[PDB]
């Protein structure tokens, strides 16, 4: 087992969740099986008890563990299934070793941060690292650690007195630490005092990095580099950069332009580890795959416009797996991708009194989209907003897609607008008043990868064609309130077909609308599911629909 | 409400516990009403899971929580009495900002060790410090707040951290810092090095400390005081030392002697805190007697001899509120006190074959002893060796005390020896064999201050005329396993009279023997409840009787 | 005396110099009298032997010292005038008790760097800050500490110490300290953790910051401001920003915007200082005249371009008081000014064939200029470069002015082409081939504050006019070549006037040339006399020739 920490820098904000998904992409192309691991100094035990204004959306993996945002980057980099282990955190530590002192297992000595708090966190890493994480049933060959926070707050001091420990605790060429580091510019001069005391803080720990890794925006001077690699013990080859391009899929190659894997490839001695004939073919096929959809993000220049509806939307980070999953749908396609980012509340009338400005701004960015994304996310604040998309969307003929609450939202529009029921409404935030016409009703979380069910006559549907017409799909849920399921077959009879449910049905999953090019709904997150090379199947619908070519896409799939 | 922080230094052995109790007492000494809060950086929850061969005992509050030893320190210098909140720990925090985290208080905010946790602790201190200690109904004037570990350990951060917000978060002049540490003698001349570089380690978490209190084997030169009032903030004055004297007790006439009352004073303007005509004289009397007892050690020679029989009395510090349960005892009789430290387990005949001077040494020192304590403390080890104690002080007519453990010894030894029960013993041990013959049994423990009730005959005894003929006595619990209440009867028959039992019966609390001068035990720790004015009764009792004069304090008792 | 430390950050290039002059200049509104000094870490004694390639141009004191280019910024905001004494470095420091313990002042004690150093450094402090630097005779009512470097870098630590010290060996409300830091912005998102590391550096050193001052590309969000002054203890109006906007003559104004004069007026307690009925005049007469040359540079649009000649010109802080002197005399104009930056070696021919493209550029930008500089600067590059812009200069008619080289050079260029003596050059770098048509020669070092006399028929020039039509002139000198003064009458006698001389003659210091509208040049530097109420004179001739006006600028000047 190799370990590679991924740490610190001045800053929180440094992009080191880029740099660990990547570092270990091009470690796969080796062909070594890969693992990761988020270390999280926050005392939160997950992420699903924190608001999505905070470093971004809840992450859902198969478990049904609500994670940290980073251990997405790896699923969809890496490949890989993550365990509700594989998000250390403070809370998960301090409640672990608390609860064992309570039941006593240090059979009466006094409990310290070191050395027991710091040998629990070497043994969650040596645990959770041998879980295997590929389909296949081997055992990791790498370790991908990410160290969140930064180095010398004392909210990481636990983490960086344990991964010193650690360094020894497994060989020295099984373990090396990448140090990601802030170098800003002035005057148009490359200052490096900032890295240089980054640098101290870790000697301070007695962590030593094996490479430097700055963010800036700029190549490096090679004085730049000199003035690192003098200072610190960082050959030149090992002071890396990553400039601030938009494109995150050209990071693995500019990482490999400056040679950073054959650096590792001596300091792990990964040489060592013995490989078959099939593991470098499916490692070295891995890398021209790569090639290929970064060179038609080079070349591809037909824009499709989506725009994406909901609360709060100047926090781009609170929707990175939507982002990311219309990005490998638009890739897919061989098309360049807008997002047309659409505040939902200001889509309603009040806002055209209140601040004109932002109403026709808001309508104008509807209006020009070429499909349409209702994302999830709970609380009260826009939802009329997000009714009237869905029914811009329904009505104009435009494609839309409406994920979790995005659902429920299209589900209580074609309510309000083809049934005419006028105050049917969710049941989250009215049923003070115990209104009648429910469209939402609770059923105290449906969390983590479930099966959903076509219901029999559903092989119409371009939804069900997207899933290759296979009987059942395994999505991640994530909801506490269903669509009503006493007015389901009003819906299924006005044409508005909830095309799958779970196993007992009364619970409804997936839906699409007859008479419409591509009006889909979802009552999982497809997001979590897609991987580079295989996009989510509701989302390669919507941008192939907003496009044009969604029968050649589905003639595709039936391959 | 006015802060006195103890802290720090360059060893964990450096005794700030002493210094904290003094500083405590000599506030008292103004008749300002005080309080205290100790601190410990390790993870248990309490002292009562951890083993006594770590930080000496555990210490029993009215709570029934087992403590850290240092809350027994300030009991019995202060007078207060203290709540199992008193005593703070990393274990206590981390698991009320977690279990406070996942009921949601923090309303899905990021939870973090800043602000959250540090303002978890200033929450503490300011909720626990205003909790009335004194038998009368006033909140505290003072709060004397010790600092466990050492400043810079990792284990401390969060509270150095919290403390520096206190000292803002409630005003300066109601805060102060005593930072207390070593001054190391090398070839007669006192090197400064170590508490200069603990000065700075204050410094860089930005406490600042108001005096410097050393702790060396000598007076300070005028030198070394210099040397440290110059690389200090501190004045002269404000350079406190406590030399390495015996008697615990003349340190607060030590700190008065270096007028420390006089800087704090000024520095925390105690003139501003209002007081009564009966403080001011209560306070002024409590000093007085504090005079003559330290008088009365300086010119009392006549040594009473106490022999002390339990497990591992190497570690001194496992014994501590017996060793001041004896010396105030040994205090309010005017006579000096030797305790003899017998490794119970050396007075065993198989220590004859295995180490022959080990066995003569301990029965030298239990022969040569006027009374004898057998003191409590769970585990197996030297039992037997703890029964031809108790053996020895019955059939020599030796001043006896047993104390939890050493009652049941007494009555294990009794029943092997007057009423012949060769093979009666302990439920603890031997019950994988189902024995008949038991002398303990359980009935998952009994703690904190309970009720004895005297039962009805009882008024001949000794120890029921200790307690002043009254019907009942309040005293700390701290047990699992009791004497057999169907054996009970054959005892009192043989003249071993259960003088007292809890409210309902079948539960044994004293006892004293029919025909002996002083033979008596309690389940009960009777050193819990001394007081340095008014000492323990079943050990006032036990150091007259070993003296002679056990008729005349009786007697003084009936006034 | 009172001091105002301003100290540190995260980066050397932060902009404390702005910082420092501007708070200096806002305390002087006041009427106080006020001085300043600059620490470097640097180990030179002064700036003269180091090359302008680093920390800029050397700048000159009337005592001829070649100090730091920091000393500039101060004497050209406060008035005032600095003597070799008032930079402080390393060098300085270490020389001066290295040679006071071989004289043995120390009285065979050991020396150490506390307290010995430590208090060298505070007793040049209080020296220099009471040496007078008004023109007036009184001593400077307030000190400003520029601390070169940032903290905690090794370079620093002497000076760091000391100041803890000196904050105490000087009253507090005698001495404050401003922190300067930066505040880098990552994704729109205004990141603070570079700043609480660097408050935490100066708190480890025990140096406690009043005010905090961020530099930013952006207004501080108010959300910025608390996440600061709750992590520090600095008030929400002690958080001070300084904006990247590029008017400096602004910052003092954006400071006074932002109330920290009403801060420091409290904790300086600077209405405890006694001031006159002229002094308060005075002092509110020099803010007026502020508002008044700012609210000019926010209407004037009616550009006048300089072009500046010379070598590595991309080092703009070469020439710093050019830059000033040059805005200086545009402001007084009231006219806006475009200084066009000439590497003078592209204007040779050689760079035809070379690289083309830097041959096209530099011809064209110096072909647009209203008006040319050849600024000086020791060294062979470019100088026929130079010498070709002296050409263009004469020959197309258009404003020259050359100081110190610059004159040399229109010297060499009026003997190659005006007197036809084509190989006649300067004795810098021909004299290994002693050559005999010398224009330079060597007259080691004239520096300082020096005389110039008017030779007696210059009445004509416009630089005698400019100057006053006084007869004497003082101007600061700093050469080691003058013109060869068996040459002069040539040039006398064709039209090239050595309009002033030094008090001996042989040694030439202005020239005009008869029949140029302005051609004029200087062997004193008089960019360093520029004050920005009153500009360098042969610079208001420069830049009112350009525009046009200069008879009028004449007819002021003669009131
Ligand atoms: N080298 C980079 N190139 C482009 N974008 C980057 C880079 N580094 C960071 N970012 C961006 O900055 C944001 C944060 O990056 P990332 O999640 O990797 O940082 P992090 O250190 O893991 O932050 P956090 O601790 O909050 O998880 C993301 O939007 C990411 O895409
Ligand atoms: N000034 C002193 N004079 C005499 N004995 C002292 C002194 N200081 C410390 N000691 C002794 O050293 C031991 C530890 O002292 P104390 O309990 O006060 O230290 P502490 O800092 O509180 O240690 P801990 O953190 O383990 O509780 C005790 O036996 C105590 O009596
Ligand atoms: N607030 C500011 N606004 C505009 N420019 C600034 C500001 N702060 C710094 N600068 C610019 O950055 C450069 C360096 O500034 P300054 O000389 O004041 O920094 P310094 O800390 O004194 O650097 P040094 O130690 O090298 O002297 C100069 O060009 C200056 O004009
Ligand atoms: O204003 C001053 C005065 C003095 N000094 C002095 O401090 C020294 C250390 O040099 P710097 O502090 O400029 O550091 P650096 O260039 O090595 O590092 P970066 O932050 O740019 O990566 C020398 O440059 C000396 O002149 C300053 O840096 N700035
Ligand atoms: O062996 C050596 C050589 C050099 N030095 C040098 O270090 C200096 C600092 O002096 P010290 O290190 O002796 O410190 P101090 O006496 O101030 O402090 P204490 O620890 O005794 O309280 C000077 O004494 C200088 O000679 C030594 O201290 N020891
Ligand atoms: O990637 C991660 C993981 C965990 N953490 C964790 O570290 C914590 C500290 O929060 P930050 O490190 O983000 O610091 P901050 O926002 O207070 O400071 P700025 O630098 O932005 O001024 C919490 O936010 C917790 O989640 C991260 O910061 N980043
Ligand atoms: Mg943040
Ligand atoms: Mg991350
Ligand atoms: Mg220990
Ligand atoms: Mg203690
Ligand atoms: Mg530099
Ligand atoms: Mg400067």
């Not at 494109?247 to 078959?276: N, W």
Request: aromatic share 6%; hydrophobic share 35%; with cysteine.
């Amino acid at each position: 087992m190799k370990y590679v920490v991924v740490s610190g820098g001045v800053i929180s904000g440094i992009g080191k969740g880029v740099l660990a998904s990547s570092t270990g992409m091009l470690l796969k192309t080796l062909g070594l099986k890969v693992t990761s691991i988020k270390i999280d100094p926050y005392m939160n035990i997950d992420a699903g008890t924190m608001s999505p204004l905070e470093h971004g959306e809840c992450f859902v993996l198969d478990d049904g563990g609500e994670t940290d945002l980073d251990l997405g980057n790896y699923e969809r980099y890496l490949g890989i299934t993550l365990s509700r282990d594989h998000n250390i955190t403070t809370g998960k530590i301090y409640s672990h070793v608390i609860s064992r002192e309570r039941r006593g297992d240090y059979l009466g000595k006094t409990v310290q941060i070191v050395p027991h708090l710091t040998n629990a966190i070497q043994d969650w890493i040596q645990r959770v690292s041998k879980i295997p994480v590929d389909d296949t049933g081997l055992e990791p060959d790498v370790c991908i650690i990410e160290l969140g926070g930064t180095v010398g707050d004392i909210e990481s001091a636990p983490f960086v007195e344990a991964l010193r420990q650690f360094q020894f605790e497994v060989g020295r060429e099984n373990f090396a630490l990448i140090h990601v580091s802030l170098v800003p510019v002035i005057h148009g001069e490359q200052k490096t005092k900032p890295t240089q005391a980054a640098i101290k803080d870790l000697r301070s720990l007695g962590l030593i990095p094996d490479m430097i890794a700055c963010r800036c925006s700029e190549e490096l001077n090679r004085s730049t580099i000199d003035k690192i690699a003098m200072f610190c013990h960082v050959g030149p080859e090992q002071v890396v950069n990553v400039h601030d391009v938009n494109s995150t899929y050209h990071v693995p190659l500019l990482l490999l332009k400056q040679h950073m894997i054959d650096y590792l490839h001596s300091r792990l001695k990964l040489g060592e580890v013995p490989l078959t004939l099939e593991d470098k073919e499916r490692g070295s096929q891995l890398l021209t795959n790569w090639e290929n959809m970064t060179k038609n993000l080079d070349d591809s220049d037909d824009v499709v416009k989506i725009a994406l509806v909901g609360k709060y939307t100047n926090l781009k980070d609170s929707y990175l797996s939507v982002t990311k999953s219309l990005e490998h749908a638009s890739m897919k396609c061989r098309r360049q991708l807008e997002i047309l980012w659409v505040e939902a509340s200001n889509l309603e009338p009040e806002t055209q009194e209140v601040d004109k400005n932002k109403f026709h701004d808001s309508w104008n960015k509807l209006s020009s989209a070429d499909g349409i994304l209702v994302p999830g996310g709970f609380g009260t604040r826009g939802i009329e907003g997000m009714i009237l998309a869905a029914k811009w969307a329904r009505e104009s003929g435009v494609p839309f897609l409406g994920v979790c609450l995005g659902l429920q939202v299209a589900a209580i529009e074609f309510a309000r607008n083809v049934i005419g029921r006028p105050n049917s409404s969710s049941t989250e935030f009215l049923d003070e008043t115990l209104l009648a016409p429910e469209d939402q009703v609770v059923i105290t979380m449906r969390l983590g990868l479930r099966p959903t069910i076509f219901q029999p006559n559903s092989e119409w549907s371009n939804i069900r064609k997207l899933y290759g017409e296979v009987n059942e799909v395994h999505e991640r849920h994530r909801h506490r309130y269903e669509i009503n399921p006493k007015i389901v077959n009003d819906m299924e009879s006005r044409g508005f077909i909830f095309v799958g449910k779970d196993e007992t049905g009364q619970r409804c999953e997936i839906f699409e609308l007859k008479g419409h090019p591509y009006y889909v709904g979802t009552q999982y997150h497809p997001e979590y599911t897609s991987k580079v090379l295989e996009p989510s199947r509701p989302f390669w619908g919507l941008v192939a629909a907003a496009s044009g070519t969604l029968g050649e896409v589905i003639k595709d799939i039936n391959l």
